[PDB]
Amino acid sequence: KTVFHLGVTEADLNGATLAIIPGDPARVQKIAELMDNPVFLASHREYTVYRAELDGQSVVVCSTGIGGPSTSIAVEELAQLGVRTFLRVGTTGAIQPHVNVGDMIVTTGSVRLDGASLHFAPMEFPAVPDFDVATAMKAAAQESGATVHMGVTASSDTFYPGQERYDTFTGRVVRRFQGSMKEWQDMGVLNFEMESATLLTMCASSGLKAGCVAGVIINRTQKEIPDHATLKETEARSIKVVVEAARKMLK
Amino acid sequence: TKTVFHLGVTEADLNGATLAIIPGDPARVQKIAELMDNPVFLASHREYTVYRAELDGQSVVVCSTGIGGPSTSIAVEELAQLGVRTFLRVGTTGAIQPHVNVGDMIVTTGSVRLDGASLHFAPMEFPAVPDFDVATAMKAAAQESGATVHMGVTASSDTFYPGQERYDTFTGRVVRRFQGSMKEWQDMGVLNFEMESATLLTMCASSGLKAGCVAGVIINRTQKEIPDHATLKETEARSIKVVVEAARKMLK
Amino acid sequence: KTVFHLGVTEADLNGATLAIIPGDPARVQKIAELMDNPVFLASHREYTVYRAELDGQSVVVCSTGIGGPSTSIAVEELAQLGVRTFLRVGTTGAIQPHVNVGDMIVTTGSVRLDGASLHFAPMEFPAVPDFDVATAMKAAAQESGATVHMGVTASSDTFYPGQERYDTFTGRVVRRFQGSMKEWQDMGVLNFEMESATLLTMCASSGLKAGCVAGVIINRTQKEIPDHATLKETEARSIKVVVEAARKMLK
Amino acid sequence: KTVFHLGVTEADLNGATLAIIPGDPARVQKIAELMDNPVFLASHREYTVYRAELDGQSVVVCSTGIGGPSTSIAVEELAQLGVRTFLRVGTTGAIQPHVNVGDMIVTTGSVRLDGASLHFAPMEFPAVPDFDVATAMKAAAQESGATVHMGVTASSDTFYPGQERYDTFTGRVVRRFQGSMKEWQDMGVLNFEMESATLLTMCASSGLKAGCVAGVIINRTQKEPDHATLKETEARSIKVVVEAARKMLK
Amino acid sequence: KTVFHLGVTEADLNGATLAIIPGDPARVQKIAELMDNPVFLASHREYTVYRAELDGQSVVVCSTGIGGPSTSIAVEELAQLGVRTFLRVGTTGAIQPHVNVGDMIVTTGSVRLDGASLHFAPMEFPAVPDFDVATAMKAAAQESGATVHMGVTASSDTFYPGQERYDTFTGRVVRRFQGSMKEWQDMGVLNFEMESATLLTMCASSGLKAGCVAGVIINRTQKEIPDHATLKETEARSIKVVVEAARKMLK
Amino acid sequence: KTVFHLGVTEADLNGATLAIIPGDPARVQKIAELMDNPVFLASHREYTVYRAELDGQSVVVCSTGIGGPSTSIAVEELAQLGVRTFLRVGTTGAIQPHVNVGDMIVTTGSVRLDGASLHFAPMEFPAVPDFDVATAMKAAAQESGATVHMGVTASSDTFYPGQERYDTFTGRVVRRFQGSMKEWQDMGVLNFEMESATLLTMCASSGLKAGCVAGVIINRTQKEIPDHATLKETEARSIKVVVEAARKMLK
Ligand SMILES: O=c1cc[nH]c(=O)[nH]1
Ligand SMILES: O=c1cc[nH]c(=O)[nH]1
Ligand SMILES: O=c1cc[nH]c(=O)[nH]1
Ligand SMILES: O=c1cc[nH]c(=O)[nH]1
Ligand code: NA
Ligand code: NA
Ligand code: NA
């Protein structure tokens, strides 16, 4: 039985019950190669799927693409194939001045500025990670030597107006999002990304274990542009951390 | 001058194109571009494969959107930044009316907004409606191809599974909001389900951009939940011919 | 057999399945006399009902009164008597600089600033015209020689605060509607009226065909006042257009 | 100087600050003639306007048409012309078994199943009448000898699905309103009508005094009423609102 | 045979079908001792319950604590034991400039800025008092010599941000409540308190009679924190009125 | 200055930056006595305030009363006097069959079925605890010997309809909450209580650290009635745990 979007079978996964789920298809092989015996499984649309072994145990790496809609498909189809634990790694924009490029964020809860979360739970439901996964991510991120922040993530269905960017084609932001960045800042929100609300809400309400770790690639309050070196390091550290968090989740 | 954040192309790269064809699947991009003159690969980052081509002597961009409103909104915004004003979406859809067949075409006249990204451009009250010229061109292109064509309302969902009231899933549960929702839409005359039209049409209708949506029916939900891969290739060839002809009509 | 409000029977309509639905009871006779053998049927409250013949086929002309509630009654009761196609004609106020007095607007979709549309479909449902009816109206309007605008209409339950008028008794507009005209303007919305969201949503969700065409008789952005001869020419043009749209809908 | 829809001026109203606002333009003359010196002022669309004298003081009678949108126009324009008090009269259909044809309902509050109300205040604002107007209406209703019910009215933007009628073209009722009648019944709601939520919210949030009184002519729960009872109820309703107005004036 | 939170039995109430429900448990004894044969029944949490006699009939006096949640528990459990009439007395802040400290406000309707009302009826439902109770409270207040105002009350789940207080730890008010006080003021709203929306909605939708009378302890056009010097006298007046209101409801 | 409701000053607190906040006023002394030099500070309405010392540092114990509104006042006024960390302890009813009487729950996130949370942040914002507090609570709970569950809690503005109880005066539950217990159960929610949504949302959005730990007194899915010895043992255990959680937070 092949799942419709991902194009893999349960046999393909080789008993894996844990998935690492990056956003970018290009990141899948890189993560897989940090582990043992990486094996390319399939590539369809934004979904690149690999299998590898961590401490003897089969693990899946599967990209989600951008946004909760495409993430929700990947998570659902992997769950059909037996995956029960989902470790999200992705890039993020910080919105607090104390948070620097190269820092790591582990989401304790997400502002649900998406639509897909609502297809699993009403708005009142918290977009919260599994406590064990969040604990493992904090441990792995801190043990890596990175500066780590635990806190609330604003998770948006857009990269532009939902993150109150005005340097756009229309230069307009709809009423709902006018003044919204200052509002999140004052509420102590750490960062913007585009998948965590969907991921955390669907998993918390569906008996699946999930968490999110993110490397800070930009800070919206900072005028300085990060150099190539810092970005490469950040990207390398992010995937190292997610693999080590996965190691901590294995039993 | 500037390279857009995700698409990784410049305005110079597009060679003066003001119209884009925006399929969902990156693999479908080259297939669209080769139906036109002088296709050139521009960039491929994440779910975004960008080609340029020439249609009747005018530069046309072809760019994948990936799945869903959020991914789609990035592509449209960045293409608009580089001078694109008209967007023709082509994709696959599931029919919820029993009379619509696999292989039929649907041109969306309005979208039920079961997405979140549309709200990042306009309040829920705003209609998720296409540019009338694009919708007219798509209908005509679809008819002239020999296809059975349906004009009507499309339900546009941020999920493939529960928001389209699919029950063959890991939990087998559908949240309260969406229980009975397919039969609701059906009784209301809604033709089909897909995942990008509400975001695309709302975003464009509220931003001074022209947009439309044509889709190939790959499944009828009165039979089953998961689409057969057979007849999927056949449906996809017709769909892309229709959209290139629709683009031709738009360029005058 | 006799509908509750309209005071007509199925027999009274002589097999008509198309209705032209103006707002003002006073306009019904004027529209009906553009066609052949106009016959007065009933008059109760804001509902004046005529019958006429167009290219040999029976046509109904029925006023709706102001607002979606009154309109919803008329459309429902006509539908009970076999009417399937509804052509809304009126005069409207433009909010775009480029739209002049004497231009025609054909609605491609309505902003649902009403309440009655929610009695037929949740807010997510598009207040969209039937495509054939929209097509017939565009053709009739363009063939008349008028400049025709295809676009979005804001459809409000009030004439005053919902259209952000401050020239009022209180001079206040509720928070929801503060800054709303400029918001609609920036979004490309063409005009305000008060019935289309109800008509379009109810029909699009009930297996009925509907559309709206309106003549522009004032512009909220222009200080200059239109002269009498233009206003009456626009009103005359509006009703000729809708009758020709009806002709295009007969088969 | 002359309001946009009503086609009357402030001079036309002769200093009137109170208005009686029936729904049906045909009822306007019938209310006006209960007072002194009734004079037709204007008729445009569903707005028929008369002026009259009650105890030496000028009073305006103006039809609203059906629904909150048309009502909101009438009330606003009358307000521009100095009207500060609005008395709504009608006949209605009850949803409670204990409420009989011939009884009067005085609305103490409205379920806001409309849209125009939200153009004046957010949903959390109560669609509530002015206490003096409601008090005067109760007294006048009791003084007429009828059984009077004080309570909540469900105010709907539609006559059909918003009142959970299934005897319709589609025979469907949107999810929001499925089971709603039983819901309102169990919560003690007295009746359905179509204008009060808009009228009451608009006036309560704009410094205007308003209230609603209505004769019961049909009951959704009771299988039935005599023609003589119906015209008597209609006659009583407008007698009551005029006497309610007299109380308001002094 | 005791209710879960209140710790009273039906026998404890000695036939009472009317309750006076102040907020503060300290006002319970005071109110009871304005009547005959006051008897302490129970005290648990914020719920102090007394019995007394008014013109030979049993009345219950029971504190609600602060807010709709704790109020809802008290009303429900008293209803279970046979109470059908609930007279709320409390403190309030005026938002209109003409309303002075020491004045009495009888609520004709409540702005539902609470959450507990939604546990009884959808937002569309009016938070309206029983007419007889409101009439009795007006009469009691006017007959006592006090200055009385009848009108709309804004009923908030918070004392601070929901009543637009800025003299707080953060100094910040969430978007929803920014500018809200002036909005209520412009709309003719008289006062702020914290229980009436819950109480009135619950009772109006549950076949129970309820009303609210409140003594003005602060005018918000002046300041945010109530002066201590005037509380005692204002509270003395309030409880005098509610007891007289109760006398008028006895049948 | 002395805060309005609590009746205490900053000097009263003796430098305390951490508060333990039970619901019941009667629990305040019982918690304080587990620490050194407990001293009664004030008692007004439902707010009983004590000060104590834990490993040489000042700690405050303050009752909240029932529900978010009362809680919001206590948290805000303590925050004005320098309190930055809030540890909630209480009772709860489990809705999962696997959760036994005598077990403890540490809330990782709350379903916002309250009103007061909205006065601090829109519904999209997660009702989430501070991660260090939840970590400290889990550790303290485990080291006490009890079985601990980490998970989502449904936080309701009512005890009755919002927790889908039908054994009530009216015997009915508003549409919104019909079928809601089963919904939460299928979504993996552990329990119902009445304060966590407000507490966690206000603190997470206001730069305050907060968490919630609770003893399971009763299971909605079990028929077996828990022994008196069990219920008292769990009450005692809950407060020992929160004091230990406090110790972990201080150093
Ligand atoms: O600013 C950013 C950076 C990465 N991802 C986002 O969603 N936003
Ligand atoms: O059923 C379907 C088929 C294609 N695309 C969808 O979104 N749904
Ligand atoms: O301002 C005030 C005074 C008393 N009670 C309130 O809720 N607010
Ligand atoms: O079931 C319960 C038990 C304690 N507290 C609650 O709120 N609910
Ligand atoms: Na995508
Ligand atoms: Na009308
Ligand atoms: Na309380």
Please write down the HEC assignment for all residues of F200-234: HHHHHCCCCEEEEEEEEEEECCCCCCCCHHHHHHH
Q: How far apart are CA B163 and CA B156, in angstroms?
A: 9
Cβ atoms within 10 Å of A10's Cβ, excluding its own = 15
Q: C204: which 2 tokens?
A: 């699009």
Which residue shows structure tokens 């932001």?
Answer: A173
C residues 146-175 closer than 8 Å to E (CB): 170, 172, 175
B35, B26 in Cβ contact below 8 A?
A: no
> What angle in degrees, to the nearest 10, is found between the helix axes of C228-249 and C25-32?
60
Q: How far apart are CA B88 and CA B94, in angstroms?
A: 19
CA of E155 to the centre of ligand 3 (A): 10
Q: Residue with the nearest Cα to atom 4 of ligand 2?
A: B93
> Coil, strand, or helix at residue A46?
coil
> Coil, strand, or helix at residue A83?
coil
Distance of CA F223 to the CA centre of its chain: 26
CA of E214 to the centre of ligand 3 (A): 10
Q: How far is CA F122 from CA B55, E175, E177, E233, F115, in A?
A: 49, 8, 11, 39, 11
For A133, the enclosing helix (H) or strand (E) is helix A131-143
Q: Which of F210, F179, F200 is nearest to F111 (CA)?
A: F200
Q: Which of C131, C137, C186 to mutate to probe the B interface, most B CBs <10 Å?
A: C131
Which residues, in sequence order, are bridge partners of residue A192?
A: A93, A154
Query: Measured between CA atoms, how close is E45 to chain F, in angstroms?
Result: 5
Q: A37: which 2 tokens?
A: 């015996």
Which sign, positive or negative, has the C-alpha torsion D233, D235, D239, D241?
positive
E34, E41 in Cβ contact below 8 A?
A: no
A104, A213 in Cβ contact below 8 A?
A: yes
Cα maximum dimension of chain B: 53
Domain ranges in chain D are 1-250
B168 CB burial (10 A radius; 0-12, 13-18, 19+): exposed
Q: How far is CA F136 from CA A78, A249, F241, F244, in A?
A: 34, 20, 10, 8
Distance linking the first and last C-alpha atoms of chain B:
30
C21, C88 in Cβ contact below 8 A?
A: yes
E41, E12 in Cβ contact below 8 A?
A: yes
Residue A39: partners with Cβ closer than 8 Å, 6 or more residues away: A32, A50, A51, A52
Mutate to test the pocket of ligand 1, among A64, A89, A159 (most ligand atoms within 8 A of CB): A159
Distance of CA C62 to the CA centre of its chain: 12
Residue E30: partners with Cβ closer than 8 Å, 6 or more residues away: E235, E239
Q: How far apart are CA B216 and CA B238, in angstroms?
A: 8
Q: How far apart are CA D29 and CA F221, in angstroms?
A: 66
Residue A33: partners with Cβ closer than 8 Å, 6 or more residues away: A52
Provide the 8-state DSSP code for F101: B
Surrounding ion ligand 5 within 5 Å at CB are A 46, 65-66, 70; B 47, 66-67, 71
> Coil, strand, or helix at residue C112?
strand
Q: Which of C139, C37, C40 is nearest to C87 (CA)?
A: C139
CATH topology of domain B1-252: Rossmann fold (3.40.50)
Resolution in angstrom units = 1.9
Is C183 in Cβ contact with A175 (below 8 Å)? yes
D6 CB burial (10 A radius; 0-12, 13-18, 19+): buried
Q: What residue type is E13 in one-letter code? A: L
E141, E213 in Cβ contact below 8 A?
A: yes
F41, E62 in Cβ contact below 8 A?
A: no
Distance of CA A34 to the CA centre of its chain: 18
Q: What residue type is F26 in one-letter code? A: A
Query: Measured between CA atoms, how close is C2 to chain B, in angstroms?
Result: 27
Q: How far apart are CA F195 and CA F156, in angstroms?
A: 7
CA of C218 to the centre of ligand 3 (A): 49
Distance of CA A151 to the CA centre of its chain: 14
Mutate to test the pocket of ligand 2, among B167, B185, B193, B214 (most ligand atoms within 8 A of CB): B193
Q: What residue type is C47 in one-letter code? A: Y
Q: Which of D4, D88, D85 is nearest to D42 (CA)?
A: D4
User: Is any Cβ of chain F less than 8 angstroms from the Cβ of A104?
Assistant: no
Q: Which residue out of C84, C165, C237, C247 is catalytically annotated?
A: C165
User: Is any Cβ of chain D less than 8 angstroms from the Cβ of F176?
Assistant: no
Q: How far apart are CA D41 and CA D78, in angstroms?
A: 13
Query: Measured between CA atoms, how close is C186 to chain A, in angstroms?
Result: 9
Task: Tell how strand E104-113 and strand F18-21 pair up.
Answer: unpaired
Task: Tell how strand A148-156 and strand A104-113 pair up.
Answer: parallel
For F153, the enclosing helix (H) or strand (E) is strand F148-156
Nearest-10 Cα torsion for B114, B119, B125, B127? -70
DSSP chain E: ---TTT---HHHHTT--EEEEESSTHHHHHHHTTSEEEEEEEEETTEEEEEEEETTEEEEEE---SSHHHHHHHHHHHHHTT--EEEEEEEEEE-STT--TT-EEEEEEEEEESSGGGGTS-TTS-B---HHHHHHHHHHHHHTT--EEEEEEEEES-SSGGGT--SSSS----GGGTTHHHHHHHTT--EEESSHHHHHHHHHTTT-EEEEEEEEEEETTT-SSPPGGGHHHHHHHHHHHHHHHHHHH--
> Coil, strand, or helix at residue B182?
helix
CA of D109 to the centre of ligand 4 (A): 34
C104, C148 in Cβ contact below 8 A?
A: yes
> Coil, strand, or helix at residue C230?
helix
Q: Which of E116, E96, E117 is nearest to E105 (CA)?
A: E96
Nearest-10 Cα torsion for C57, C61, C62, C68? 90
D42 CB burial (10 A radius; 0-12, 13-18, 19+): middle
Q: How far apart are CA D137 and CA D106, in angstroms?
A: 7
Which ligand has the shortest distance to the CA of B213? 2
Q: How far apart are CA B237 and CA B227, in angstroms?
A: 17
> What angle in degrees, to the nearest 10, is found between the helix axes of B69-81 and A68-80?
150
B138, B212 in Cβ contact below 8 A?
A: yes
Nearest to F126 among A128, A206, A207 (CB): A128
Please write down the HEC assignment for all residues of F155-199: EECCCCHHHCCCCCCCCCCCHHHCCHHHHHHHCCCCEEECCHHHH
Q: How far apart are CA E53 and CA E34, in angstroms?
A: 10
DSSP F65-96: -SSHHHHHHHHHHHHHTT--EEEEEEEEEE-S
Known catalytic residue at E165: yes
DSSP F39-56: EEEEEETTEEEEEEEETT
Cβ atoms within 10 Å of C12's Cβ, excluding its own = 18
Residue F220: partners with Cβ closer than 8 Å, 6 or more residues away: F93, F94, F95, F181, F192
For F31, the enclosing helix (H) or strand (E) is helix F27-32
Q: How far apart are CA E140 and CA E148, in angstroms?
A: 10
Q: Residue with the nearest Cα to atom 6 of ligand 4?
A: F193
Q: Which residue out of C5, C84, C237, C247 is catalytically annotated?
A: C5
Count the residues in chain B. 252
Which residue shows structure tokens 């960008």?
Answer: B50
Q: How far apart are CA E145 and CA E143, in angstroms?
A: 5
Cβ atoms within 10 Å of A75's Cβ, excluding its own = 28
> Coil, strand, or helix at residue C176?
helix
- Please, which experimental method was used? X-ray
Nearest to B127 among C128, C138, C150 (CB): C128
The number of C-alpha atoms within 13 Å of E186 and in the hemisphere containing its C-beta is: 15
Q: A205: which 2 tokens?
A: 């309400």
E175, A186 in Cβ contact below 8 A?
A: no
Q: What residue type is B121 in one-letter code? A: F
R_g (Cα) of chain D, nearest Å = 17
CA of B68 to the centre of ligand 5 (A): 6
Q: How far is CA B54 from CA B14, B238, B239, B247, C79, in A?
A: 11, 20, 19, 11, 50
Residue A227: partners with Cβ closer than 8 Å, 6 or more residues away: none
Distance linking the first and last C-alpha atoms of chain A:
27
Q: How far apart are CA F82 and CA F13, in angstroms?
A: 9
Q: How far apart are CA E153 and CA E194, in angstroms?
A: 10
Q: Residue with the nearest Cα to atom 5 of ligand 1?
A: A92
C52, C61 in Cβ contact below 8 A?
A: yes
Which sign, positive or negative, has the C-alpha torsion B26, B28, B29, B34?
positive
Q: How far apart are CA F134 and CA D212, in angstroms?
A: 55
- Neighbors of chain D by Cβ distance (3+ pairs < 8 Å): B, C, E, F
R_g (Cα) of chain F, nearest Å = 17
Known catalytic residue at D51: no
C45, C63 in Cβ contact below 8 A?
A: no
DSSP A139-189: HHHHHTT--EEEEEEEEES-SSGGGT--SSSS----GGGTTHHHHHHHTT-
Which residues, in sequence order, are bridge partners of residue D107?
A: D151
Which residue shows structure tokens 């006036």?
Answer: D203
CA of A176 to the centre of ligand 5 (A): 24
Known catalytic residue at D172: no
Q: Which of A133, A134, A135, A127 is nearest to A202 (CA)?
A: A127
Q: Which of F86, F118, F177 to mutate to probe the E interface, most E CBs <10 Å?
A: F118
Residue F19: partners with Cβ closer than 8 Å, 6 or more residues away: F59, F60, F61, F62, F78, F83, F85, F86, F87
A23, A92 in Cβ contact below 8 A?
A: no
Q: How far is CA E79 from CA E18, E62, E136, in A?
A: 10, 12, 21
CATH topology of domain D1-250: Rossmann fold (3.40.50)
CB within 6 Å of ligand 2 — which residues?
B 92-94, 160, 164, 193-195, 218-219, 227
Is C67 in Cβ contact with D114 (below 8 Å)? no
Distance of CA E75 to the CA centre of its chain: 12
For C52, the enclosing helix (H) or strand (E) is strand C47-54
For C86, the enclosing helix (H) or strand (E) is strand C85-94
Q: How far apart are CA E71 and CA D30, in angstroms?
A: 49
Q: How far apart are CA E14 and CA E21, in angstroms?
A: 17
Which residue shows structure tokens 């419709």?
Answer: A4
Please write down the HEC assignment for all residues of chain D: CECCCCCCECHHHCCCCEEECCCCHHHHHHHHCCCEEEEEEEEECCEEEEEEEECCEEEEEECCCCCHHHHHHHHHHHHHCCCCEEEEEEEEEECCCCCCCCCEEEEEEEEEECCHHHHCCCCCCCECCCHHHHHHHHHHHHHCCCCEEEEEEEEECCCCHHHCCCCCCCCCCCHHHCCHHHHHHHCCCCEEECCHHHHHHHHHCCCCEEEEEEEEEEECCCCCCCHHHHHHHHHHHHHHHHHHHHHHHC
Q: Which of B159, B195, B226 to mutate to probe the A interface, most A CBs <10 Å?
A: B159
Q: F244: which 2 tokens?
A: 């230990």
For residue C172, which residues of chain E lie inside 8 Å, CB to CB?
A: 186
Q: B200: which 2 tokens?
A: 């695309």
D234 CB burial (10 A radius; 0-12, 13-18, 19+): middle
Cα maximum dimension of chain D: 53
> Coil, strand, or helix at residue B34?
coil
Q: How far apart are CA D169 and CA C72, in angstroms?
A: 12
Q: How far apart are CA F142 and CA F105, in angstroms?
A: 11
Q: Which of B105, B109, B146 is nearest to B129 (CA)?
A: B109
Q: How far apart are CA D86 and CA B73, in angstroms?
A: 50
Q: B102: which 2 tokens?
A: 């696999």
Domain C1-251 class, CATH top level? alpha beta
A12, A61 in Cβ contact below 8 A?
A: no
